From a paper:
Mounting evidence indicates that CRISPR and Cas proteins represent a microbial immune system that protects against invading foreign genetic elements, such as plasmids and phages. [name] is one of four Cas proteins that comprise the Nmeni subtype of the CRISPR/Cas system. The results of the mobility shift assay indicate that [name] [name] has a non-specific dsDNA-binding function. The tetrameric nature of [name] [name] results in a diamond-shaped ring structure with a positively charged inner surface as seen in E. faecalis [name].
The only CA2 site in the asymmetric unit of the [name] [name] structure is located adjacent to one of the two hinge regions in monomer A. The calcium ion in the CA2 site is coordinated by three residues (Glu138, Asp142, and Glu150) from monomer A, Asp118 from monomer B of the symmetry-related dimer, and two water molecules. In the corresponding hinge region of monomer B in the asymmetric unit, we were unable to locate a calcium ion. Based on these observations, we concluded that, indeed, no calcium ion was bound in the potential CA2 site adjacent to the hinge region of monomer B. This may indicate that the two types of calcium-binding sites, CA1 and CA2, have different affinities for calcium ions. The absence of calcium could also be a simple artifact caused by release of the calcium ion from the more exposed binding site during purification. It is important to note that the lack of a calcium ion is not a result of the selenomethionine (SeMet) labeling as our 2.9 Å native data also indicated the absence of calcium at this site. In contrast, we purified and crystallized [name] [name] without the addition of excess calcium ions.
Numbering used by the authors:
A (entry chain B), C (entry chain B): 0 to 219
B (entry chain A), D (entry chain A): 1 to 48, 51 to 219
The structure:
């Protein structure tokens, strides 16, 4: 489906499902990593899907610091909250029930308000405020770089707008089993993930890359 | 408590409501002003005999423009409404149970969501915050708003005295009479600095001659 | 020129220059004061100039707390700064000189930057940053409600977009002399100012107002 | 200083540059990870014999994504550039005089303005702030940026050790060699946790057997 293509490359590389990509040469390795952080419209490196429609900065999700990756970023949390709200909208028997419950709870407070001396006014209580007040956030149970990768994988999956995930030099932290559970999940869930590796990652189906930008396959 | 300074033979006593007329245009302006710039060694003094710090004094000049929806005041209102429920365990308990139901319907959405989500609680305080309860001021009459200023004043426990500058001019005798009753009832300490005599309530007067009188007792 | 007109009024009141306006009745007094704080499009009270073009919330400047009035509000300061900048633009021989001076001063710093280890980049230094850095602000010398009124008057004058000033119940703080110096300045500077007073302000030309909304003049 | 924990017969010594290879995939991951969650009683230890607090340790995993334009770092850069002038009184003095001229042309505009305006001074620090001097990163190579991380590291005096996780993979031997020279020259203390041997520099190795070796001395 997806392509990694730029000037110095013979053929555009296929990014289909899980994909390990070795860049033997230290210089091509950094060049490519860095062209990744530097990804933008004006960029050396182009990623695009089958329809040749190019993946934008925003659609890529790039991880080098696996531990550092924040699963409860505000950006993620806003989305989750907004998402949980729209779940309600699609079950109208429950939004009705939420509505009745808030309407009632509101009166009971306004009751105390009327009771209070002050001329007190008020707005409404929204589903979002309830979710936000409840403190819904992503579970952080993973206590290992490996467990973490899976969570990053889960989240990547969860963000429908993030289309490609790139782990950079992540092989270093992963038993052959772990790498396989990962690729397992990635097959299972239909994720396009790229692993920019500096050396061969065990004996998994994977692509390699000369200092000359010549492309061999391996372990098929 | 007391108001004192150098020109006064003897300090002025501030229990509950205390109306102070200054009829010398220039002494009115000096005293209102000294009040406003009040500090540790200001020319003008206030005390219990421990002197009131500035921070323990609120001063209202512009009534309608005074913000009674300050954070500290909201925070206070809100904990007060909450605590109104601790007097009504019956209803509070229903609220706990209603909140539990919302919680459950939300957690169910949380499970049904692909992500492994955790959560905490929803508290009555959060519901109150969420509801955006605040004092309504936008339509007020000066009188209505004086009352609100008084009502919020009771909360600021830190503050010991509230001063009203030249508010009389805006008030019907009956309105003034209301606020006295309320001041008296709420065990509050309040001063109205006036240019002129305020109808016929008990009040103090200092003239051009600087002779301090007492009236309508 | 300007008019104070609303429903309960016989004739629209002329606001020309300084203007004292007594509202004998406690109720009409508050009603009117309050209709002032509550001024907006949907409002009881209308102010408009000669061309019957109505003065907006923003064009009025309403003072009850004379001491409290902040002459160094951010809003005032932004304007002053922006204004001082445009002074420069209109003296091109001086903007040239400012320009030469900054361009030079910049190099001398960039010089130190080049000298510094780090790859350091930089932007520019603007006239505004110079003004802001210099800490230009309005002088606060007035140590009396009276001195203050004059400063508020100066500022009112300074804001070309603020078209009417209303002092509310300010008479209370003002010797007959002071009131006169004020009206003096207001004549001198061409200001439209209104003094909502609850009682007669000495013996100055002024308008009075019945509990019935009947309008007499006085002291002409 | 030193890195120590339970599996090590004897602590590892951290003077200047110190490269530490962990070749057991699982011990690499454990140690990188322990580093990251380091605290008071973490499994992993660091000390002078007073242990380094977490706050005294900076850790780089994502090189290009690390923010060297932090407030604390800018604040520091800027006071350093200023102080570069105190070594050049001649030029500084011209700058004082140039600034005085701008000041004067501004004050003149201040007088010419209808309002009575006051003012303070313009300082070199303000000019530097205004100028928006910061480290340029936007075009960096990983190597270039390591260098900048090092260069800013010298400033944070609070921090005692900087750790680089698995940065080797990105670096030419000659690039690595550069950063060693610079570390050595700047009297800095630095650790590179590596999965594999880093070319042929002096470095420490811990294997699957957990046998600690020393190499290329
Ligand atoms: Ca709300
Ligand atoms: Ca909560
Ligand atoms: Ca009200
Ligand atoms: Ca700038
Ligand atoms: Ca300055
Ligand atoms: Ca650079």
């Amino acid at each position: 489906t997806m392509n990694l293509n730029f000037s110095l490359l013979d053929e555009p590389i296929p990014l289909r499902g899980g994909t390990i990509l070795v860049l033997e040469d230290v210089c091509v390795f950094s060049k490519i990593v860095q062209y990744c952080y530097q990804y933008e419209e004006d960029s050396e490196l182009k990623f695009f899907d089958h329809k040749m429609k190019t993946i934008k900065e925003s659609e890529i999700m790039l991880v080098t610091d696996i531990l550092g990756f924040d699963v409860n970023s505000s950006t993620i949390l806003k989305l989750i909250h907004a998402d949980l709200e729209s779940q309600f909208n699609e079950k109208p028997e429950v939004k009705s029930m939420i509505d009745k419950l808030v309407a009632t709870i509101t009166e009971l407070i306004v009751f105390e308000c009327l009771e209070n001396e002050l001329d007190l006014e008020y707005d409404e209580i929204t589903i979002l405020e309830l979710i936000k007040s409840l403190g819904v956030k992503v579970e952080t149970q993973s206590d290992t770089i490996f467990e973490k990768c899976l969570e990053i994988l889960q989240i990547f999956k969860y963000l429908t707008k993030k289309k490609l995930l790139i782990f950079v030099n992540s092989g270093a932290f992963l038993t052959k089993d772990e790498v396989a559970s990962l690729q397992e999940y990635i097959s299972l869930t239909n994720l396009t993930v790229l692993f920019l590796e500096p050396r061969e990652l065990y004996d998994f189906p994977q692509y390699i890359l000369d200092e000359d930008y010549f492309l061999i396959t391996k372990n098929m």
